[PDB]
Each structure stands twice: as C-alpha cells, then as structure tokens.
C-alpha cells in the first residue's frame, strides 16, 4: 500500500502549498466592491475648490499675491524674482550665487548676529535659493510675525552692506565649495547636461560660475547686480497661510520703496540672447566609481508652450523608480516595468524641465556597469514607443496620477507660496486647478503621439554620463534608437 499523503515530508509540503493555493482560489466579495484596476477619467470640479489667490499690482509694477488661510497658525512670506544665472554675462557669471551667500550677512540696521537673533527669537526660518532663471528669498514664521518677516526681507533686499571682510570670507567658502563638487553626482550630471545641451547660450552656464569670477567679486559687483536685476516689475511678493491681502499690500507699499526701476525687461533679455539645443554629449569616464549615472535628453518645451502639459503627462507615463519601491514590476509605466522586472538599474527618473524659451525632456538613470547596454536599450525603446503606440489606459492612468500628484504635493504654506510665486513668474498668473485639470484631460493618446513625433522622433539627443560607462552605447546608437525602421 502506498503511503497516505502526509507521511512523506515532501508530500506533506505539497499538501500544504496546495491548500494555500485553494485558499487563494476563492476570493471574498465584500473586499472587491469599489476598487478597480482600470483607470477612468473622472470629473470632480466640486472638491477642487480652493481659497482665492489675490493679486495686486503696485504703481511701480510690483505684484503682491496672497493665499489666505486664516485658520492656519503659520504663514510663508517671500520674494520671487525673475533673475538668475541665465541673465548674467560671462564675466558676471556666479554673481547671483554669491549674492545668495551674502544676502543674510547684515544691513545698516542689523548686523549678522542681530539678524540671526531676531529671526530665531521668533522661531522663524529664512531660506534663499537661486536657479538659472528664478531666485527666491522667503521666511516661514508664525502668523504674528508676518510684518516682521516682510521688514526683514525688504531690509536685506534694499539695504545690504556687503562688508569687504565678509565678502572675502564668503569668497573662500565658495571657492572651497567649487573645490568640493562631489558626492552629489545627480546635480553634477545635470550641470554637464545643461552645459553641453545649451552650448554657447546663457542657459548652459552653471549657477556657481568659474573660480576666477568668484575671486574677482567685489562690493560694487553685487550692488550693480542688485541694481540691474532686482527691479519692481521682475519681483513678486507671495504670502500663504494666515495672512490678509490688505495688510500685506500696505506693508509692501511701506517697505519696498528704494528699488532699482531699471528698464531692463526679461522678455527682451531672452530675445537678444536666446537658448538653443545642440545635439552633443560629455562622457566622464571614471572606472573607480561603483555606479554609473547618465542622462539622455531631448529638447523640450518652454513654460507657456501648450505642449508642456502633454510633456508632463508623458513624463508621468515614463515614471520614476528605485530599488526600494515595492511594486515596480506592476506599475502602469512599461519602462519602470522593464527596469524592475529585469533588475537593470538602481534608479530611473524621467524629467521635464521648462525654461522661458526652451526645455529639456529626458531620463536620468543610475545603474551598474554591466547593466548599461540593456538599460539604454529599454529607455530608448520606451521613449520612442510614445511616437508609435499609446494605449488609452496608459494615458488615462498618467492623467489621473499627474492630477493627483499636483494636488497632493500642494500641502503646507511653503509649497503654496512657492507655487504662487513660480506661476506668477512663468505664466503671469496662478492657473486655477480646474483649468489645469481641463488642460490635462485634453491630452489624449493622439495628443501624446503628436507631441512625441514633434519632440522625440528622429531627433538629436544630449547625453551626460559619469562612472564606469565604457559599455554605455555611443551617440550614434542612441541616435539610431530614436526611430523605428519597421514603420
């Protein structure tokens, strides 16, 4: 007689696994009532209500924009300026970053210690960030100290001292910062991508600038920079949280009196020094780094181009992923599926960067040396596929994800104030959520195919790579993988 099906150890294990499988064979319908794996385009313009964003223009062209939440206990107030490294010159390059270092270094009324003691006595925070086309200084304070923060910002923008010893100390701080450009390889890769893609244009310069420029920086340089660029028509004062529009407007009218009023205007600056894309690559071969990092990019779209929304949808379609994400093998993005299913990268990330007259659309990846060939094939395949085959489900899911991320990231006074300032600088207005959603849902599969055929198909690419990249395919192979010869 044969043994019964629990005597032998392997038969018993087979019985256990079979019983578990039968348990999975019969689902419970109470837990299968609402969620669906099929994406549906939904219209919910009722929940989309938000507090009004008041925009007031002063007689000198200064704009004050507030988003009031008087139930909040805090607020974010700041200045967003249409200024950055792109609007400098070759010999002035780096001045904006130096000013960012020097702006909290004391004024006629306040010394460095007074300024820090005033701020951190109320528990506030002071932030300064400069980019290629945008500069912002803002304060996160309690609702009571809105007027004090506005006074602090107006003072530092209008009455900075720029002591020569302070300038010399910051000169060496920044020189050491330039000498220590390592450990942040993402930022390095993107800098080299900008440098080679926007060759011989103001957009190709780094924010930091060359070492000789920072060595040559003096007081009159910084004062001339502020006089040239920090003008009323180029500045937006944005407040979010527990703030009333009228009080902020009155305080701004009181404090921001001695501005520059230089006639220099950003549209003319972009017009006479335009940014163009040059198909090109920089390969920084270093076989001691454990991981390779590269970015591939196409020429993208400007802020105001209608195709920018479609490019955002396409970026969502490509997606982003790293090895610590649980479900990369199951996501809607085919590129993420390929990468996660075959373990061919440490991280992947699609980016859509916009500027006033151009943009960058591409993919940034981190991977081991031996994965590079397959990873490059997969990236190029899935990017080029956007010009040929787009399913309605994928574009619907991407639209839903994009709307969700845009609304979900907008939490807190600081992100709201940043959104207000950025939109006022790039669009001239804060685009209401309903209009943005309507523009997003106008991006269908045919729209994605049209935009991809305009921007991706048979197009020059810019590459920036660093690390053990000897097996990264050369420029001709990436250029060939931008079209499909079976169509």
């Amino acid at each position: 007689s044969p043994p019964p099906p629990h005597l032998m150890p392997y038969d018993h294990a087979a019985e256990i696994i079979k019983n578990k499988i039968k348990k999975l064979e019969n689902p419970d319908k109470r837990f299968l009532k609402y969620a669906s794996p099929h994406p549906i385009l939904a219209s919910h313009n009722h929940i989309l209500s938000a507090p009004e964003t008041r925009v007031t223009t002063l007689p000198n062209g200064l704009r004050v924009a507030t988003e009031s939440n008087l139930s909040a206990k805090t607020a974010t107030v700041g200045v967003w300026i249409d200024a950055g490294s792109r609007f400098e010159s070759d010999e002035t390059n780096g001045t904006a970053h130096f000013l960012e270092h020097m702006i909290f270094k004391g004024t006629d009324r306040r010394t460095v210690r007074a300024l820090e003691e005033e701020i951190e006595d109320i528990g506030g925070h002071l932030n300064a960030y400069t980019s290629r086309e945008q500069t912002t200084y803002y304060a996160k304070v309690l609702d009571s100290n809105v007027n004090q923060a506005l006074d602090v910002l107006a003072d530092i923008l209008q009455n900075s001292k720029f002591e020569e010893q302070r300038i010399n100390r910051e000169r060496d701080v920044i020189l050491r910062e330039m000498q220590e450009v390592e450990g942040q390889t993402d930022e390095v890769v993107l800098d080299h991508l900008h440098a080679t893609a926007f060759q011989y244009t103001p957009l190709g310069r780094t924010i930091l600038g060359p070492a000789q420029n920072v060595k040559s920086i003096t007081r009159e340089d910084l004062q001339n920079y502020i006089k040239t660029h920090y003008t009323a028509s180029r500045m937006v004062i944005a407040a979010a949280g527990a703030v009333k529009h009228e009080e902020v407007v009155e305080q701004v009218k009181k404090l921001f009196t001695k501005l520059s009023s230089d006639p220099t205007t950003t549209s003319q600056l972009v017009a006479n020094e335009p940014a163009s894309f040059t198909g090109s690559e920089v390969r920084m071969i270093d076989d001691d780094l454990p991981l390779a990092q590269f970015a591939v990019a196409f020429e993208g779209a400007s802020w105001t181009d209608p195709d920018s929304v479609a490019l955002m949808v396409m970026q969502t379609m490509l997606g982003s992923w790293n090895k610590n994400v649980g479900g990369g093998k199951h996501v809607g993005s085919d590129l993420t599926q390929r990468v996660a299913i075959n373990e061919i990268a440490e991280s992947i990330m699609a980016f859509n960067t916009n500027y006033k007259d151009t943009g960058l659309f591409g993919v940034y990846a981190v991977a081991k040396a031996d994965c590079l060939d397959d990873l490059s094939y997969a990236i190029m395949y899935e990017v080029t596929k956007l010009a040929y085959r787009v399913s309605d489900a994928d574009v619907t899911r991407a639209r839903n994800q994009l709307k969700s991320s845009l609304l979900l990231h907008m939490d807190g006074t600081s992100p709201i104030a940043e959104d207000i300032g950025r939109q006022l600088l790039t669009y001239g207005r804060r685009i209401p959520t309903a209009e943005l959603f309507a523009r997003i849902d106008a991006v269908d599969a045919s729209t994605v195919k049209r935009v991809a055929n305009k921007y991706i198909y048979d197009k020059d690419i810019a590459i920036s790579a660093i690390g053990p990249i000897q097996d990264l395919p050369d420029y001709n192979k990436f250029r060939r993988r931008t079209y499909w010869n079976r169509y």
């Binding site: 330039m178 000498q179 080679t196 190709g204 920089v282 270093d286």
Partner: peptide
C-alpha cells in the same frame, strides 16, 4: 595641482571647443 580630468569633471564648460 589638480589633474585635467578632475578639473573638467568639477567645472562644466558651456564653451566647449
């Protein structure tokens, strides 16, 4: 002194020849 490759990696150049 700093070798040329390190300087190139540390200083992106938009005036590439």
């Amino acid at each position: 002194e700093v070798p040329a490759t390190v300087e190139a990696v540390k200083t992106p150049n938009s005036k590439i020849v």
